[PDB]
Structure formats: structure tokens, C-alpha cells
Specification:
8 strands, 11% strand, globular, binds zinc ion, zinc ion binding, EC 2.7.7.102, DNA primase small subunit, ribonucleotide binding, DNA_primase_ssu_euk/arc
């Protein structure tokens, strides 16, 4: 896309919320078939408004109310929270201890910024087609586990609008899970641990680990050795050696002198040994226990507009995950200009992402029978 001009946001958001934001589908999602009384009415939303004012515990009676209020506010940001015991918008007059978060989707947030230590292609602020593969591997690794291991059927993956991806797991039994169970699921999925301060972040037959390695193996040569060139030279192969036990920088150090490029140094490195701890530290999703653990946690809404890149937080088609290109995700300016020429929200580049969302909603409806 063309570089977004954020000075146009106020007028562009007005048009987007008036004519493009997919309210019918969004309500069909969060009302979950209307089978539980007040399920939508007790949903918390939060918004960031004019002047960067943040408000939470907003809630709405039905789709019309949500439309009217979003068109009044034209929010820069929208976050979705839990379903509560009472309407969030009356929480200040609910008795102490009685206002309780009851249900919420299980959510995950993987962001490129947590990989600064293992990519060589970008500054912490950029992404490129080389490092985006990290997100591809994250989706495959996490989605396989959610689908195959946990048996979760209703998984919506969503672009963050800039440099990450989110997952909303929406099964009926999943929305009821306790914070303790959510924590358990995160810890089951986590293998990379340690802040900036930690040089070795992976310490290892765990089936989930083997499964995840086998996914990584399909990408590793092209991603790590060919694209990231994690052994192009000394100050990078060093980083790897920092992960191998006390006593071998020697042999390796000197053969990396002899050997010519990352591919050779790798075929070598393997011979001696570890391989897995390396592959995982470089390729495995880094989670964030925080966002997934709490039933009341707020996460960016699908179909949000990113205030810096202008890009829409679009659903990602899992059947085309390897082809997903954040750089072709439409900006709000792009789709408003399409709408200006076509006069039909169906005749814009948003429509195909709404179709992905509709397939997700159709499966939810089928599950309810
Ligand atoms: Zn990059």
C-alpha cells in the first residue's frame, strides 16, 4: 500500500464507520446466535476517542445502538473485553463485588517486536517479507495445537494492522474457561522464556514440541539460513554459539572460518551435537501469558483501523496462511477511495476479508445447529 497519511483519519474514520465497518457480521459474531440472554448486551467494549481519550465499560443494547454510537464516536481504536454479569455501562452503580466478568473468547497475541533478538533483516520498527515468515510459523504452530490438541473448532486469526497477529478462540465451552485453565493452556504452548536479559531462552520427548519442530523444519532452511543468514559471519554465528554449551566455540568458530556460508555451517553444527533449542529460539512463537490468562482482558477488535499504518485488522484465511501479505492489506484511505468510486461496500477490497469472517460465522452457526 501507499504510505498512509494519518492527518486524514478523522474524516476517513467517519466514512468508514458510516459505510464500511461490517456491523451485521460483527453483531452476528458477538451475539452468538442470540441463544443466551444478554450475551451481547453485557459485552464490554473500550474505545480511544478524539484527543486520545480512552474509555472503557461501554456496552450496547443491539446492533442499531452499536452503529449509532460508533458513528457518533468515530473511535481511533476499539477493544473487545469480557461478557459481564451486568451491563458494563452501568458498572459504577453495581454493588462492590457483584460486577463480574463471566465469559470471553480465549485470545492470543503474537507480535514481531518480541523477536528483536533473532531477526537480522529489520529495525525493531519495520517488518519485511523475510521476517513475516515468523508470523506464518506462529499461526501454524499455535493453530495446529488449538485444533488438533485441544479440539477447538472456532478459531479466528486476525492481522494486528501492523506487525502481529491475534487469535480469537470462540467455541462455546472455550468462552467459559476459567483464568486458571487459560493460564494452563498458555504454559502448555510456551517454550521461549526470558526477557531482553536472557541469552538462552529455550531449555529442553514432548509431543507438542516434536509437532512444532516438524512445522518449523519445513521453513527453516529458507527462513533461517537463506533469508536471515543467521551464520553469514562472525558476530551472528557468535549469537548462536552463545546458545551452545561451554566448550565448542573452538571447532565451530574455526570451521565457520573454513565453511563458506550459513547452509554449510548448519549442516556441520548438526553433525556434532541443541539443534532444536536453536530452531525454537529463532522460530517459535513468543506468547505473552498476560493477554491470554485473564477473562477480563481487552484485545484489539477485528476490523479496527491502525492509527499509524491505516491498515484494517483483517481476518486471515487459514487455507492461505503462507500467502498472507501484510503489505497488501488495505488501508482505510484505500478502501474509502474505492467506496467513493463504486458506492457499494461490496465493491471494495474489504469485501474478501469479510468473506473470510462470514465463513467463520457460518461454522459457528452450524455448531449451534
Ligand atoms: Zn524483516
Amino acid at each position: 500500500m501507499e504510505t498512509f497519511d494519518p492527518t486524514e483519519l478523522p474524516e476517513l474514520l467517519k466514512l468508514y464507520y458510516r459505510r464500511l465497518f461490517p456491523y451485521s457480521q460483527y453483531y452476528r459474531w458477538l451475539n452468538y446466535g442470540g441463544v443466551i440472554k444478554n450475551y451481547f448486551q453485557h459485552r464490554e467494549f473500550s474505545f480511544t476517542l478524539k484527543d486520545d481519550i480512552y474509555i472503557r465499560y461501554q456496552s450496547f443494547n443491539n446492533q442499531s445502538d452499536l452503529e449509532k454510537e460508533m458513528q457518533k464516536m468515530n473511535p481511533y481504536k476499539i477493544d473487545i473485553g469480557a461478557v459481564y454479569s451486568h451491563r458494563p455501562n452501568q458498572h459504577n452503580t453495581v454493588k462492590l463485588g457483584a460486577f463480574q466478568a463471566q465469559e470471553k473468547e480465549l485470545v492470543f497475541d503474537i507480535d514481531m517486536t518480541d523477536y528483536d533478538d533473532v531477526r537480522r533483516c529489520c529495525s525493531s520498527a519495520d517488518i519485511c517479507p523475510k521476517c513475516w515468515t515468523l508470523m506464518t510459523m506462529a499461526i501454524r504452530i499455535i493453530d495446529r495445537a488449538l485444533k488438533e490438541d485441544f479440539g477447538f473448532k472456532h478459531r479466528l486469526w486476525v492481522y494486528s494492522g501492523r506487525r502481529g497477529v491475534h487469535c480469537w478462540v470462540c467455541d462455546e465451552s472455550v468462552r467459559k474457561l476459567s483464568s486458571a485453565v487459560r493460564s494452563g493452556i498458555v504454559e502448555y504452548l510456551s517454550l521461549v522464556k526470558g526477557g531482553q536479559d536472557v541469552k538462552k531462552k529455550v531449555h529442553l520427548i514432548h509431543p507438542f514440541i516434536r509437532k512444532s519442530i516438524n512445522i518449523i523444519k519445513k521453513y527453516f532452511e529458507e527462513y533461517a539460513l537463506v533469508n536471515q543468514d543467521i551464520l553469514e559471519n562472525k558476530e551472528s554465528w557468535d549469537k548462536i554459539l552463545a546458545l551452545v554449551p561451554e566448550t565448542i566455540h573452538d571447532e565451530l568458530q574455526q570451521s565457520f572460518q573454513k565453511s563458506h556460508n550459513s547452509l554449510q555451517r548448519w549442516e556441520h553444527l548438526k553433525k556434532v551435537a541443541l539443534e532444536w533449542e536453536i530452531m525454537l529460539q529463532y522460530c517459535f512463537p513468543r506468547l505473552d501469558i498476560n493477554v491470554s490468562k485473564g477473562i477480563n482482558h481487552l484485545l484489539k477488535s477485528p476490523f479496527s483501523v491502525h492509527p499509524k499504518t491505516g491498515r484494517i485488522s483483517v481476518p486471515i484465511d487459514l487455507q492461505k496462511v503462507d500467502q498472507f501479505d501484510p503489505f497488501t492489506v488495505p488501508t482505510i484511505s484505500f478502501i474509502c477511495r474505492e467506496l467513493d468510486a463504486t458506492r457499494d461496500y461490496k465493491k471494495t477490497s474489504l469485501a474478501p476479508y469479510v468473506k473470510v469472517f462470514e465463513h467463520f460465522l457460518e461454522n459457528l452457526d452450524k455448531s449451534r445447529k
